[PDB]
Amino acid sequence: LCNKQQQQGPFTFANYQESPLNVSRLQIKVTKTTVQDRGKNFIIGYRAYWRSYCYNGGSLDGNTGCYNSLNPKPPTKDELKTWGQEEVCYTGPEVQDAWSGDSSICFVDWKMDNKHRAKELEKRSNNNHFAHHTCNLSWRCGVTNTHLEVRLVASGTQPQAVIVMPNGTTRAVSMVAETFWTDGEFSYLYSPKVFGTRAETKFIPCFKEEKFHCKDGDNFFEFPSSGFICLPDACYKNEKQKNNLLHPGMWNISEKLHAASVYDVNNVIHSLVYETESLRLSLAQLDHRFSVLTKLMNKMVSSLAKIDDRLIGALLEKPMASKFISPTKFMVSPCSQTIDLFNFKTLWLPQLVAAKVEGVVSDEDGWTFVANSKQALLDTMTYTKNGG
Amino acid sequence: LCNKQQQQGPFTFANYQESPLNVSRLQIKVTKTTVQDRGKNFIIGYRAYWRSYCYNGGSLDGNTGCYNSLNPKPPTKDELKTWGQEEVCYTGPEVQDAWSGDSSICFVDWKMDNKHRAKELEKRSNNNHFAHHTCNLSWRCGVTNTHLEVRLVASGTQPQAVIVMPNGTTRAVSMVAETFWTDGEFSYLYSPKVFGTRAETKFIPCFKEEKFHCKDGDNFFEFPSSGFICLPDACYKNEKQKNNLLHPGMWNISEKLHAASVYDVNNVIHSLVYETESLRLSLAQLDHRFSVLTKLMNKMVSSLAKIDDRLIGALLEKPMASKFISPTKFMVSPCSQTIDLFNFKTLWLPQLVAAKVEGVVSDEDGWTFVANSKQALLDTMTYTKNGG
Amino acid sequence: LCNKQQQQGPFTFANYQESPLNVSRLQIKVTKTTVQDRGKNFIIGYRAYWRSYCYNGGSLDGNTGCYNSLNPKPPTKDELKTWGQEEVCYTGPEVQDAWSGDSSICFVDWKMDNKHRAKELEKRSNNNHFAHHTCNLSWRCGVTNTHLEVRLVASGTQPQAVIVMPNGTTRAVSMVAETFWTDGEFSYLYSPKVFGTRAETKFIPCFKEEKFHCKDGDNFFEFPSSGFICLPDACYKNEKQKNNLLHPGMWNISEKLHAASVYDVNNVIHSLVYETESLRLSLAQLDHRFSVLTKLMNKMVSSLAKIDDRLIGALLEKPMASKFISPTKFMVSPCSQTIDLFNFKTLWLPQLVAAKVEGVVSDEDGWTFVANSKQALLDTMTYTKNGG
C-alpha cells in the first residue's frame, strides 16, 4: 500500500540533448592541377677524362713535372639522346705511357668513338722518359634512363612545373621543348609526352571544423583559408576564387628532402594509441547507454504487457499471450503511407583510408645514380698508379 | 476536443533498418615461417695495406719513380673468428723509410702478427735515396660483432633466408654451416644457433572486406588473394593452399632501404585527422539518436504511468506512486528461464595496436661500420705524407 | 483465440549488461622540464690550410722532395663570434709558387687578415726550382648561423641539457657561459638567451589502461611506472614522486638519428586500416542495436496508443488522435524539478590529434653544413695541381 494523501512536485521528465557539433561533410568543387608524366622520361649521363701531361727534362729544367687535370666533358643533347637510346656512352681513347712521339695525343679533339656500357677512369701518371713528354688519358662515362617525378610550386600565382634537386634548388621545366641542362660532368635531359600542366574539375571530400580537413585519393591535406593550396604533386584551387589571383598555400620543400626519424613515427603510434583509447571510452559510454535503455524497456514492457497480453508475443514475433504471476514474473500461453517516429537515417561510417608514401628525393634512382657516380670518382682518385 | 468523425490513412510505423555490411572478423589458420636469430651472430672485419715501393736512380734512369698500390687482404674465416672473439685484428708490419737494405721488406709474406684494436693506415711515400729503393708500408684493420637480421624472399615457392645488402643485392644464407663471404677489404661471417627456417601453425586475426586486412602481433598487412605472402621478417601461408605450390606475395625491397620523408608522415597525420573527424561525425549521429530515443521514451512513460502508477517508481527503483496534475506534469507519493527482447551481445571494441618500426638497412650497425670504415679510408688517402 | 488454460514459466526479462572497462581519463599533475631556446643561437665555423713546402736540390740531395700537410686552424671563440656576426671568415694568404726568396712564407704566423664569405682551398704543389725551396699555401673557411635544438638526458636523476652529435655522442651544455668547443677544422659556439633548464607545473591528459597513455600538445607518450620520463625535448615528472630521486624513463638516442623506412610507415598504414575496419564493426553493431530498438518501440507504441489515443500525436508533436483499424494499422484524426530516467551525460568525443615530426639529427642545418664542408674537402683533395 501507498499514501495517496500527499504528493510532491510537480515533476517533469528531463530529456537528453545532444551536444551541438560543427563538423560537417563538404563536397568542395576545386580545380586540381597535375603534372603527371608516367614512364621513363629522364636520361642522366656523365663523362669526364683524366689527363696527366708530364715532361722529364731533369731537375735543372724548369719545365720538369706533370700537368694534371680532371676535365669534365658532359654529353650534348643529341649525344645524351643516343646514349640513353643505346644505354652506352661514347668517349675518347685510353692512352697509357705515350711518350714524345705519341705524347702529343693528350690534345687531339679526340672525337669520341669508344663505346662503353660502363667505364671508370684510372688515375695513372708517368714521367720516366728523359728529355721527353709522357701522356696518360683515362675516361669515365655512364648513362641511366629513369622516371622523373616533377613537382609544383607557386613563385606567386599560376603554379609552375618544377624539378627539385637533392640540395633544395628548383629548376623550372621548359614548357616548349625537352628541358635539357648541364652541371659539371653530368647532363640531364627530360622529355615528357605532353608539356605544360593538366587540371580537372572535381569534388574533393572534406570535414569542416575555420578549418577544412580534406582528402583526394591518397592525398590528405588541410584546405587553407582562401581555397588555394599546392601539394608536391598537385595544386587544388577552389572555384569561388577561380577568377581570383591568389598566392596558394605552399608545401615545405624540406619535407620531401629530409627523412622522418623512427621517433617521429613512434610519436605517431602513441598518438594513435591515444585516440584508440579515446574512442574506446566513447564506445563504452554508448554501450552503457544501451544497457540503461534495455533496463528501462524491460520495466516498461513488464507494465504494458499487464494490459495488452498480446504485446510480448508481438515483441518476440511469436503468437502468445502473457499472464503475470508477479510484478516481474509472467507466464506464456499459446495463440499505404507510414509514420516515422524516429526519422533515423543511414549511419555514416568512416571509410577506409591509406596515405601515399613516396620517400625522399635523394632516394630517387636518378639522383641515386648521380650520387654513386660521384662516389665512384672519389674512390678511384685516391692514389696515383704508375703507368710505367 | 478532437474530431473522431473522419480519419486518414491507414498508417503503419516505419521501422529503421541497418545498412548491411560485409566486414567480418576471421581467425585465419596460417603457417607462419620465421628466420629469427637473436644475439650477436655477425662479424665484419676489414684489412688492407698501403704499399709505396720507390726507386731513385736519377732522372735518366727509366726505373726512377714509385710503384704504389692499395692492396686488400681480407681475413680468412678462422682469422675473422679469432678477431671477433678477441675484438682485435692482426696485420703485418708498419714500415717507414726502409731503403735499399731494408727496402726488400715491401714483399715478404709478412705473416700478420701485429695486433690492434683499431688501426688506420698512413699514406706516406719517400724516394729520396739515390740509386736505392725505398719502401713504405701502412696497414688498416677493424672488427665488429653485431646482430644481423635476416629477411625472407621467394624466387619462386618455398621462401628462402636472405641477407640484404644496402645496395639492394641479396645473398642467400647457407643452410649447412656458417655462411661466410668476402668483398674487397671486408669479410663477413654469419653464424646462427640453428640453421634453415622455423614456422608455426597459428591463427591471425583479420577483417574480411575480396580484401583481407590482417594483424599478427606488431605486423599489419593485407592478406592476398591466394593466401600466401612474405613480409621481410616472416611468411604467412594459409593452409587450404598448404599443399599447393604458389608464388607468395612479395614485399618490395626498396621499402626497407629507402627512408620515408617528413611529408609522407605528415600525410599520414592528415589522413588520421580525416578519419578522426569522420568518426566524430558518426559518434555525433549516434548521440543524436539517443536524444531522440530519450524524448520518445519520456513521452511514452508519461502515457503509461497514467495507467500504471507503479511504473515510474520501478524505473527509478524507488517505491512510489505517480499522480499526474497535467499531461506532462505529475506528483509522486511514497510506498527459472528468462526472455531476451533485445538479443544484444557484448560490444566489440577496437583493441590497442602499435606497429613495428625497425628503420632502414643502411642504419644497421654492421653496414654502418662498413660505411664508416670506407669513409675513414677516403679521409686518410687525401694526400701523401713524406716519410723522410 | 488463445489457450489461457495452461501456461509456461515463470519467465523474467533479461537485462543487457555492459562489459566493464578499465580505461579512464586522468589529468595527471606533472613537472615538465624544458630547454627551449628559439632563434639563431648556434655558430659553426671551420678553417684549415694546405701547405706544400718543397725543395729541388737534385736527385742526389736527400732533402729533395715535398713536405705537405693539411693543417687545421679552427677559429677562437672571439674569432667565431665576429665571423658569425659578419658571416665572413678570416684566413691567411694565398701563396702560389713562392720560391727561395718568398719560399719562407710557408711559416710566418700569418695573422689571418684575408676576409672571405666562402673560400675553398686548392691542392697545388711545385718543385721545379733547382737548389731552391718552393711554397704553396691554400686556405679554406666557412661560417654558418643556425638554430640548435638541445635535448634532455638523465645520466641518473636531475635531467641535463645536451647537444647530440650525428654519431650519437652527447655534449653537455655549459650552464654558466656560452658553451664553446673545437673538433679538428671546426669550432662550435652555442649561446642561448637564458641558461639552465625551465619547467612548469601542468596537467597532461592520459588514458589509464598498469599502463598510462598520455598526450602533451604534439607529444604523445606512454607514462612509465614510477611517474618520471624524459623525451628528447622535455621531461615529465609526476609530483607524488616530486620529492623522490628517480632515474626517469629514457628515450632511445638512435630513434632521433636513424630514419624510418617506407615499409615502417606502410606498416603504420596497415595498422590504421585494421583499426578503421575494427571501429566500423563496432559502429555496425551499434547501428543494428538501434534498428532492434526502433522495431521494439514501434510495436510498443502500437500497443499503448490503443489505450492512449493522444500518444502518437505527442510523439509526433502534432495534435491528433489515433484510431486503429488493425493491430498494426491505424487512422489519425485532428485535434519546478525534473526527473531523469536516463542519467545520460554528454558523450565523450575523441579530440583531434596531430603528432610532432621533427626529422633526424643529420638533417639539421648545422650538421648538414659540417657534412657538406667535409664533402667539399674530399672533392678538392682529389688530385694535385701544378702551380708552375
Side-chain angles (χ1 to χ4, degrees):
Chain A
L1 197 78
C2 308
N3 199 11
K4 301 317 105 209
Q5 281 291 321
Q6 308 304 325
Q7 273 89 325
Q8 208 291 328
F11 280 109
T12 325
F13 284 143
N15 291 343
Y16 168 63
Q17 193 61 30
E18 70 265 61
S19 295
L21 203 140
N22 297 81
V23 179
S24 52
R25 150 146 275 197
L26 270 284
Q27 283 282 347
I28 308 198
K29 187 178 165 192
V30 299
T31 278
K32 169 188 165 173
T33 325
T34 61
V35 287
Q36 189 85 4
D37 195 81
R38 303 220 181 257
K40 302 193 145 182
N41 46 23
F42 202 46
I43 312 169
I44 309 196
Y46 66 92
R47 169 187 58 190
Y49 66 89
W50 165 249
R51 170 201 289 159
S52 171
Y53 187 69
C54 307
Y55 179 75
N56 177 1
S59 302
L60 289 178
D61 187 16
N63 304 327
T64 286
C66 292
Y67 271 11
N68 307 338
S69 74
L70 263 173
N71 312 90
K73 274 274 170 311
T76 61
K77 201 170 190 176
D78 323 310
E79 258 175 298
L80 187 44
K81 292 191 186 183
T82 179
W83 280 15
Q85 191 188 345
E86 310 185 0
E87 295 209 26
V88 311
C89 35
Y90 297 92
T91 52
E94 189 83 40
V95 175
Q96 189 170 6
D97 198 353
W99 46 294
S100 40
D102 324 306
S103 76
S104 53
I105 206 183
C106 261
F107 320 91
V108 152
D109 204 25
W110 304 276
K111 256 52 175 305
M112 334 284 182
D113 45 346
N114 290 340
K115 129 182 168 50
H116 328 271
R117 323 218 309 126
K119 170 68 181 64
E120 193 49 39
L121 65 88
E122 180 176 37
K123 185 194 186 184
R124 56 173 188 270
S125 174
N126 204 36
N127 198 32
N128 64 324
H129 291 301
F130 188 81
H132 282 357
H133 290 271
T134 302
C135 171
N136 286 277
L137 194 65
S138 206
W139 286 85
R140 74 186 314 264
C141 83
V143 70
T144 207
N145 300 288
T146 58
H147 149 85
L148 183 67
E149 214 71 56
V150 176
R151 279 71 155 95
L152 279 166
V153 303
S155 165
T157 314
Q158 283 102 13
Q160 303 131 339
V162 153
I163 310 157
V164 190
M165 301 328 150
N167 58 27
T169 287
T170 166
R171 171 154 291 255
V173 176
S174 98
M175 310 162 191
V176 174
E178 277 194 327
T179 167
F180 161 87
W181 80 91
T182 280
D183 194 332
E185 281 185 35
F186 300 77
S187 286
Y188 314 79
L189 172 71
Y190 177 78
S191 313
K193 330 217 203 74
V194 85
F195 294 85
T197 51
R198 178 186 188 271
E200 53 178 9
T201 326
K202 64 176 297 187
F203 295 81
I204 61 160
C206 301
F207 288 111
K208 181 180 196 164
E209 169 81 289
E210 187 180 33
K211 295 280 186 177
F212 295 81
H213 303 275
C214 304
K215 147 200 157 72
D216 173 48
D218 44 8
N219 288 349
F220 302 81
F221 53 94
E222 183 172 340
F223 206 50
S225 66
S226 211
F228 192 13
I229 185 181
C230 278
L231 297 189
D233 51 353
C235 295
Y236 304 92
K237 193 180 191 180
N238 177 41
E239 298 97 352
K240 304 152 38 185
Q241 299 133 13
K242 166 178 181 172
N243 297 346
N244 294 112
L245 293 298
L246 310 107
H247 297 333
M250 182 70 187
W251 55 290
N252 279 322
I253 184 50
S254 46
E255 274 166 50
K256 293 289 284 179
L257 308 173
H258 294 170
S261 69
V262 154
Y263 180 86
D264 283 326
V265 169
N266 285 313
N267 205 38
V268 160
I269 280 167
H270 282 307
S271 68
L272 177 62
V273 164
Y274 189 89
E275 293 291 285
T276 299
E277 293 282 68
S278 207
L279 181 271
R280 282 166 73 86
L281 262 193
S282 291
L283 287 195
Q285 172 173 352
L286 281 190
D287 184 52
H288 160 88
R289 294 183 171 195
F290 272 109
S291 169
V292 172
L293 291 195
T294 49
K295 303 181 170 197
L296 294 181
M297 291 181 69
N298 280 348
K299 299 170 190 129
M300 284 172 62
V301 169
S302 160
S303 180
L304 183 75
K306 293 196 166 86
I307 308 153
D308 198 332
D309 53 354
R310 296 336 309 287
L311 176 67
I312 292 178
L315 301 171
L316 299 177
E317 297 171 293
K318 268 178 303 210
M320 76 169 59
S322 64
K323 190 40 167 145
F324 276 80
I325 72 163
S326 166
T328 61
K329 314 155 82 182
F330 58 86
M331 298 277 187
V332 297
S333 307
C335 287
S336 71
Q337 282 255 38
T338 67
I339 287 202
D340 192 355
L341 299 167
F342 312 97
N343 306 136
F344 288 176
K345 282 129 168 182
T346 49
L347 174 65
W348 163 255
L349 294 164
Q351 309 213 232
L352 298 184
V353 153
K356 178 200 300 185
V357 183
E358 284 199 333
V360 296
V361 170
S362 52
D363 282 338
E364 295 177 14
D365 297 350
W367 310 121
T368 300
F369 168 78
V370 176
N372 291 325
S373 148
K374 297 176 172 176
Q375 185 59 28
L377 179 86
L378 287 181
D379 289 339
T380 180
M381 299 289 312
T382 37
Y383 74 100
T384 306
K385 291 85 190 180
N386 205 311
Chain B
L1 197 78
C2 308
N3 199 11
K4 301 317 105 209
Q5 281 291 321
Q6 308 304 325
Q7 273 89 325
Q8 208 291 328
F11 280 109
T12 325
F13 284 143
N15 291 343
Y16 168 63
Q17 193 61 30
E18 70 265 61
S19 295
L21 203 140
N22 297 81
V23 179
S24 52
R25 150 146 275 197
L26 270 284
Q27 283 282 347
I28 308 198
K29 187 178 165 192
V30 299
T31 278
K32 169 188 165 173
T33 325
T34 61
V35 287
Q36 189 85 4
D37 195 81
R38 303 220 181 257
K40 302 193 145 182
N41 46 23
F42 202 46
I43 312 169
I44 309 196
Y46 66 92
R47 169 187 58 190
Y49 66 89
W50 165 249
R51 170 201 289 159
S52 171
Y53 187 69
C54 307
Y55 179 75
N56 177 1
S59 302
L60 289 178
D61 187 16
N63 304 327
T64 286
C66 292
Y67 271 11
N68 307 338
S69 74
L70 263 173
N71 312 90
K73 274 274 170 311
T76 61
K77 201 170 190 176
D78 323 310
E79 258 175 298
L80 187 44
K81 292 191 186 183
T82 179
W83 280 15
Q85 191 188 345
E86 310 185 0
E87 295 209 26
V88 311
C89 35
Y90 297 92
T91 52
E94 189 83 40
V95 175
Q96 189 170 6
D97 198 353
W99 46 294
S100 40
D102 324 306
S103 76
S104 53
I105 206 183
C106 261
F107 320 91
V108 152
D109 204 25
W110 304 277
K111 256 52 175 305
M112 334 284 182
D113 45 346
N114 290 340
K115 129 182 168 50
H116 328 271
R117 323 218 309 126
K119 170 68 181 64
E120 193 49 39
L121 65 88
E122 180 176 37
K123 185 194 186 184
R124 56 173 188 270
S125 174
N126 204 36
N127 198 32
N128 64 324
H129 291 301
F130 188 81
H132 282 357
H133 290 271
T134 302
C135 171
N136 286 277
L137 194 65
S138 206
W139 286 85
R140 74 186 314 264
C141 83
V143 70
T144 207
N145 300 288
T146 58
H147 149 85
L148 183 67
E149 214 71 56
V150 176
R151 279 71 155 95
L152 279 166
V153 303
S155 165
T157 314
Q158 283 102 13
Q160 303 131 339
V162 153
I163 310 157
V164 190
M165 301 328 150
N167 58 27
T169 287
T170 166
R171 171 154 291 255
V173 176
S174 98
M175 310 162 191
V176 174
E178 277 194 327
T179 167
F180 161 87
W181 80 91
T182 280
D183 194 332
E185 281 185 35
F186 300 77
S187 286
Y188 314 79
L189 172 71
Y190 177 78
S191 313
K193 330 217 203 74
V194 85
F195 294 85
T197 51
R198 178 186 188 271
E200 53 178 9
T201 326
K202 64 176 297 187
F203 295 81
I204 61 160
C206 301
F207 288 111
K208 181 180 196 164
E209 169 81 289
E210 187 180 33
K211 295 280 186 177
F212 295 81
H213 303 275
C214 304
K215 147 200 157 72
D216 173 48
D218 44 8
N219 288 349
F220 302 81
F221 53 94
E222 183 172 340
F223 206 50
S225 66
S226 211
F228 192 13
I229 185 181
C230 278
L231 297 189
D233 51 353
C235 295
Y236 304 92
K237 193 180 191 180
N238 177 41
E239 298 97 352
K240 304 152 38 185
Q241 299 133 13
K242 166 178 181 172
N243 297 346
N244 294 112
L245 293 298
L246 310 107
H247 297 333
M250 182 70 187
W251 55 290
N252 279 322
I253 184 50
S254 46
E255 274 166 50
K256 293 289 284 179
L257 308 173
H258 294 170
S261 69
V262 154
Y263 180 86
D264 283 326
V265 169
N266 285 313
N267 205 38
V268 160
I269 280 167
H270 282 307
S271 68
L272 177 62
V273 164
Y274 189 89
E275 293 291 285
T276 299
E277 293 283 68
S278 207
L279 181 271
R280 282 166 73 86
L281 262 193
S282 291
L283 287 195
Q285 172 173 352
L286 281 190
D287 184 52
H288 160 88
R289 294 183 171 195
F290 272 109
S291 169
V292 172
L293 291 195
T294 49
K295 303 181 170 197
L296 294 181
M297 291 181 69
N298 280 348
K299 299 170 190 129
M300 284 172 62
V301 169
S302 160
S303 180
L304 183 75
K306 293 196 166 86
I307 308 153
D308 198 332
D309 53 354
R310 296 336 309 287
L311 176 67
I312 292 178
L315 301 171
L316 299 177
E317 297 171 293
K318 268 178 303 210
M320 76 169 59
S322 64
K323 190 40 167 145
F324 276 80
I325 72 163
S326 166
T328 61
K329 314 155 82 182
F330 58 86
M331 298 277 187
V332 297
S333 307
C335 287
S336 71
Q337 282 255 38
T338 67
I339 287 202
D340 192 355
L341 299 167
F342 312 97
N343 306 136
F344 288 176
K345 282 129 168 182
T346 49
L347 174 65
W348 163 255
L349 294 164
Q351 309 213 232
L352 298 184
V353 153
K356 178 200 300 185
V357 183
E358 284 199 333
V360 296
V361 170
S362 52
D363 282 338
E364 295 177 14
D365 297 350
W367 310 121
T368 300
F369 168 78
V370 176
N372 291 325
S373 148
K374 297 176 172 176
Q375 185 59 28
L377 179 86
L378 287 181
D379 289 339
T380 180
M381 299 289 312
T382 37
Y383 74 100
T384 306
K385 291 85 190 180
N386 205 311
Chain C
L1 197 78
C2 308
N3 199 11
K4 301 317 105 209
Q5 281 291 321
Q6 308 304 325
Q7 273 89 325
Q8 208 291 328
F11 280 109
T12 325
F13 284 143
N15 291 343
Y16 168 63
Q17 193 61 30
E18 70 265 61
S19 295
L21 203 140
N22 297 81
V23 179
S24 52
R25 150 146 275 197
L26 270 284
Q27 283 282 347
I28 308 198
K29 187 178 165 192
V30 299
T31 278
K32 169 188 165 173
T33 325
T34 61
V35 287
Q36 189 85 4
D37 195 81
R38 303 220 181 257
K40 302 193 145 182
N41 46 23
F42 202 46
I43 312 169
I44 309 196
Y46 66 92
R47 169 187 58 190
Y49 66 89
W50 165 249
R51 170 201 289 159
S52 171
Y53 187 69
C54 307
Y55 179 75
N56 177 1
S59 302
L60 289 178
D61 187 16
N63 304 327
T64 286
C66 292
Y67 271 11
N68 307 338
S69 74
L70 263 173
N71 312 90
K73 274 274 170 311
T76 61
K77 201 170 190 176
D78 323 310
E79 258 175 298
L80 187 44
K81 292 191 186 183
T82 179
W83 280 15
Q85 191 188 345
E86 310 185 0
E87 295 209 26
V88 311
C89 35
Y90 297 92
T91 52
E94 189 83 40
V95 175
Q96 189 170 6
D97 198 353
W99 46 294
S100 40
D102 324 306
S103 76
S104 53
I105 206 183
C106 261
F107 320 91
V108 152
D109 204 25
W110 304 276
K111 256 52 175 305
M112 334 284 182
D113 45 346
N114 290 340
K115 129 182 168 50
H116 328 271
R117 323 218 309 126
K119 170 68 181 64
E120 193 49 39
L121 65 88
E122 180 176 37
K123 185 194 186 184
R124 56 173 188 270
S125 174
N126 204 36
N127 198 32
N128 64 324
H129 291 301
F130 188 81
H132 282 357
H133 290 271
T134 302
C135 171
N136 286 277
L137 194 65
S138 206
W139 286 85
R140 74 186 314 264
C141 83
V143 70
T144 207
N145 300 288
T146 58
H147 149 85
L148 183 67
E149 214 71 56
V150 176
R151 279 71 155 95
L152 279 166
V153 303
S155 165
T157 314
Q158 283 102 13
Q160 303 131 339
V162 153
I163 310 157
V164 190
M165 301 328 150
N167 58 27
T169 287
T170 166
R171 171 154 291 255
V173 176
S174 98
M175 310 162 191
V176 174
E178 277 194 327
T179 167
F180 161 87
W181 80 91
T182 280
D183 194 332
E185 281 185 35
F186 300 77
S187 286
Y188 314 79
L189 172 71
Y190 177 78
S191 313
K193 330 217 203 74
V194 85
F195 294 85
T197 51
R198 178 186 188 271
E200 53 178 9
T201 326
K202 64 176 297 187
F203 295 81
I204 61 160
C206 301
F207 288 111
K208 181 180 196 164
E209 169 81 289
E210 187 180 33
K211 295 280 186 177
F212 295 81
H213 303 275
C214 304
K215 147 200 157 72
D216 173 48
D218 44 8
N219 288 349
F220 302 81
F221 53 94
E222 183 172 340
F223 206 50
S225 66
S226 211
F228 192 13
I229 185 181
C230 278
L231 297 189
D233 51 353
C235 295
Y236 304 92
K237 193 180 191 180
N238 177 41
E239 298 97 352
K240 304 152 38 185
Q241 299 133 13
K242 166 178 181 172
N243 297 346
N244 294 112
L245 293 298
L246 310 107
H247 297 333
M250 182 70 187
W251 55 290
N252 279 322
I253 184 50
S254 46
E255 274 166 50
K256 293 289 284 179
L257 308 173
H258 294 170
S261 69
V262 154
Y263 180 86
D264 283 326
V265 169
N266 285 313
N267 205 38
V268 160
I269 280 167
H270 282 307
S271 68
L272 177 62
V273 164
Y274 189 89
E275 293 291 285
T276 299
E277 293 282 68
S278 207
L279 181 271
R280 282 166 73 86
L281 262 193
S282 291
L283 287 195
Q285 172 173 352
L286 281 190
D287 184 52
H288 160 88
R289 294 183 171 195
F290 272 109
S291 169
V292 172
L293 291 195
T294 49
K295 303 181 170 197
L296 294 181
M297 291 181 69
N298 280 348
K299 299 170 190 129
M300 284 172 62
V301 169
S302 160
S303 180
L304 183 75
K306 293 196 166 86
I307 308 153
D308 198 332
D309 53 354
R310 296 336 309 287
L311 176 67
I312 292 178
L315 301 171
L316 299 177
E317 297 171 293
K318 268 178 303 210
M320 76 169 59
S322 64
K323 190 40 167 145
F324 276 80
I325 72 163
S326 166
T328 61
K329 314 155 82 182
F330 58 86
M331 298 277 187
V332 297
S333 307
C335 287
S336 71
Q337 282 255 38
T338 67
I339 287 202
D340 192 355
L341 299 167
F342 312 97
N343 306 136
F344 288 176
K345 282 129 168 182
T346 49
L347 174 65
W348 163 255
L349 294 164
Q351 309 213 232
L352 298 184
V353 153
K356 178 200 300 185
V357 183
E358 284 199 333
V360 296
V361 170
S362 52
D363 282 338
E364 295 177 14
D365 297 350
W367 310 121
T368 300
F369 168 78
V370 176
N372 291 325
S373 148
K374 297 176 172 176
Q375 185 59 28
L377 179 86
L378 287 181
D379 289 339
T380 180
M381 299 289 312
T382 37
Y383 74 100
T384 306
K385 291 85 190 180
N386 205 311

